[PDB]
């Protein structure tokens, strides 16, 4: 996260850090608890990933340093990538992680509510992007979970900032005209959480963008509300 600040422990209880154990363990992407055994994240996070066996999901984390060899984690039983996904910039950058065990909800770990189709006309004015991602284009994973408030921008506007791409209705953008605050490398798969009516809603999934926090270059996120039926379909046993 660029231009953000340290989060308060348990402030974003649905936020998980997805680690890979290959070649040595390291943070790979962000993700969001949406079910007792379901993590919603970004499909592009799995480039090269051949098996769920090398994945480890850690919940209730604030600092990466909390994560050691003796720290409990959730194994991944299945990786479900949208069959229409090809690359981040094209869309359908969404994926589900079916955990090998169920998450016991608590103040440090609980699920975030999915947006409702009737919530497509709502104007979210209190959105935040979070992650252990880069603070600078060429930096490294951050120890403490960062947060940044970022206003949403209409797709028409986003399109103007990305004339080389096609911004579809299954995408949603957020950023400041002058940049300064944005998601960056390592925040991918993480949530774009918007508080509406005293309830936090998973509005988007950190997907892509040109550089980080650049002026006139909003971050592009997967528009979650467009995938509620897909999510129901893939999670319904």
**Nearer CB in complex with ligand 624: 34/172:** 172
Task: Please say if 207 is a catalytic residue.
Answer: no
Closest approach of ligand 624 to the CB of residue 96, in Å: 17
For the stretch 80-114, what's the b/e string if a residue is b when 16 or more beta carbons lie within 10 angstroms of its beta carbon? bbbeebeebbebbbbbbbbbeeebeeeeebbbbeb
Which alpha helices (H) appear in the chain, and where do they start and end?
A: 155-161, 228-235
Tell the residue number behind the tokens 């060429």, with chain if given: 138
Q: Is 163 annotated as a binding residue?
A: yes
Taking CB under 6 A as the criterion, the residue among 81, 88, 194, 224 binding ligand 624 is 88
User: In this structure, what DSSP letter does residue 114 have?
Assistant: P
Residue 109 within binding range of ligand 624, rule CB under 6 A = no
Task: Please say if 119 is a catalytic residue.
Answer: no
Say which of 7, 32, 59, 188 is annotated catalytic: 188
**Nearer CB in complex with ligand 624: 100/210:** 210
* DSSP track, 149-194: E--EE-HHHHHHHTTTS---TTEEEE--TT---B--TT-TT-EEEE
Closest approach of ligand 624 to the CB of residue 236, in Å: 27
Cα–Cα distance for residue pair 226/231, rounded to 1 Å: 10
Q: Is 56 annotated as a binding residue?
A: no
User: In this structure, what DSSP letter does residue 69 have?
Assistant: T
Binding mask 152-191 for ligand 624 (x = CB under 6 A): ------------------------------xxxxxxx---
Say which of 44, 59, 193, 201 is annotated catalytic: 44
> Which segments are annotated as binding site for heparin?
160-163
> Catalytic amino acids?
44, 93, 188
């Amino acid at each position: 996260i660029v231009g953000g600040t340290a989060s308060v422990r348990g402030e974003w209880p649905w936020q998980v850090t997805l680690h890979t154990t290959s070649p040595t363990q390291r943070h790979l992407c962000g993700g969001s608890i949406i079910g007792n055994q379901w993590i919603l994240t970004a499909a592009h996070c799995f480039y090269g990933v051949e098996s769920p066996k090398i994945l480890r999901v850690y919940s209730g984390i604030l600092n990466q340093s909390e994560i050691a060899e003796d720290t409990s984690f959730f194994g991944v039983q299945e990786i479900i990538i949208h069959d229409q996904y090809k690359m981040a910039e094209s869309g359908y950058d969404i994926a589900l992680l079916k955990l090998e065990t169920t998450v016991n909800y608590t103040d440090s770990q609980r699920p975030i509510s999915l947006p409702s189709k009737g919530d497509r006309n709502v104007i979210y004015t209190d959105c935040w992007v979070t992650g252990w991602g880069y603070r600078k284009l060429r930096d490294k994973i951050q120890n403490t979970l960062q947060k940044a408030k970022i206003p949403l921008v209409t797709n028409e506007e986003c399109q103007k900032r990305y004339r080389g791409h096609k911004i579809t209705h299954k995408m949603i953008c957020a950023g400041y005209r002058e940049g300064g605050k944005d998601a960056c490398k390592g925040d991918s798969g993480g949530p774009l959480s918007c508080k509406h009516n005293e309830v936090w809603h998973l509005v988007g999934i950190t997907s892509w963008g040109e550089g980080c926090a650049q002026r006139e270059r909003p971050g592009v996120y997967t528009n979650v509300v467009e995938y509620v039926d897909w999510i129901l379909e893939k999670t319904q046993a």
